Amino acid sequence: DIQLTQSPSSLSAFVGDRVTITCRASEGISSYLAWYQQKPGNAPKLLIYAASTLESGVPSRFSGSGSGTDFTLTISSLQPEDFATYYCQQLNSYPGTFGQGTKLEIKRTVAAPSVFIFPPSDEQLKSGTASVVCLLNNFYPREAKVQWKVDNALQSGNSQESVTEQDSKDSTYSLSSTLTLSKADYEKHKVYACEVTHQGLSSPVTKSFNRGEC
């Protein structure tokens, strides 16, 4: 089968910037490639077809080039309405594989997150489960690492994360991670912590608590 590698995963840019999105097919697919734009909550919109043909109605700033394995989508002068996810698609054979996508986000200065940790509430413990929450607030770029530690044992497989959409006013992200344990497991340990790794931090930040206000 044909694999399409779309790069980068995310791209940071300003209104007026020239942006290039890359797509690499595992084999020569000549000009059987399309480019789509998708905004959250919306259907994809065709931008370029047959690798370099601009779809009718699409603005001139969008252009595609390439034939064979290496393709590129160029946006010569970003407009406010171009911050969206972009996808390449091979039209050479079934199943018409789409690329992984490139989210085009607003460029901003680096902002370190403010880290907060929340123990499970007494109300939640009564029902048998403990959710421990770690908040990484208003940071930039999106790339952040959250490491949970319970009595200094690095936890893997019992946490889930969620990130907000880039903020319309300060262009930052926020992230919430939840560590879920049973009440019985929660009471077998004392030190609960989340260690945060980010470009805006000179070294990792750890917020912790001792079970029982200890």
Place this chain on the structure above:
Amino acid sequence: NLCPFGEVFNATRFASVYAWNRKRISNCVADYSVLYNSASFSTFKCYGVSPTKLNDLCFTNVYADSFVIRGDEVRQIAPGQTGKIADYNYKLPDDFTGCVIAWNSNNLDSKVGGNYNYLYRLFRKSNLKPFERDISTEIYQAGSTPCNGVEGFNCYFPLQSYGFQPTNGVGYQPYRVVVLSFELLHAPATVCGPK
């Protein structure tokens, strides 16, 4: 008086599949053993005939059809198949009696930048009947408003160029195909094997 198989298989140029070529082979001695004993073909499938027993058989006429398609399309040149080729370019009947012979032609039909001379019909309202050859270049009406010979919105050019480059994956490289049909009518047999 040997059958001119050399003219068909060794032709310097093959036809586009939409406008497939037919050569009526008649009144000649046919040595099919030059074809079976050849390490040149990737596909050699016979239907209603044994490939080694062809030299013992006699037919009213033999038809030799030839065209260029992709490697992943050769499987559509068989009875009971669907796809852009079987549906809109070259259709074999369910009771097909004959052989389908194919070989990679990347060294002859692919160009550095794209060939563009090899086409295939991409749009057709309905499937072809077996052995139907449609060579119409009429603009394809995809909507309610007439095209009137103008390419545009809901008005496509019915043919598409293959655009063969030597940097394509094997299943997307050009393949030359010769389909031999064996006709058996209540009339004299003009094409017999060596006796």
Place this chain on the structure above:
Amino acid sequence: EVQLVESGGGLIQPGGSLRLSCAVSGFTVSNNYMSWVRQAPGKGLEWVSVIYSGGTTYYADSVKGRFTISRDNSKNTLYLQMNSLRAEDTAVYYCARGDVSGYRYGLDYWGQGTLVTVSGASTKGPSVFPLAPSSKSTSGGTAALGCLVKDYFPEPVTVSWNSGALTSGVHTFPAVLQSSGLYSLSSVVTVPSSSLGTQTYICNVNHKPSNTKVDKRVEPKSCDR
């Protein structure tokens, strides 16, 4: 004015059946390659199936034997019969004009989409728990507090603070689907730590599917002895 309108989506249990429709205007369905493409929540695009004008149909290996594309020339409508539905089939389904194999034009017109949810989870209102501000860590700066909206089905829930009077600093997170098949979400707000004793903070959670309306007061944690 080209328009593609899908319908038929909704909540269904694994093993069930569902038929999607797509009323079209602007081109003739019977004369075109018509495709079905789907997008799972938070994921990319996945082509499902195609029907040719001549009748030929193709499917993606993940839907083969369970899905059937078809159309009605008289109603200019395209259908997708989805049998033996699995949790993975949960996606927004789009009908689009075009094909994806030796078709250089791509998929030029797409419908708005229809969400199909395949789940055996029971509709359940969330439990709402406080994410109490750290009162011990007070420094004449910024505090964070919130609400954990746990174990609900289906989406969505709405979260407001102080009946809409508290909006700045609020971050309501996208819900995450737990292994139990229920959703969980948190809503946080950063406030001045100086206000933790004089200002009341309440999250107002609404879950229309279960008719649940919960108001939760979030207070700094008190001592024990």
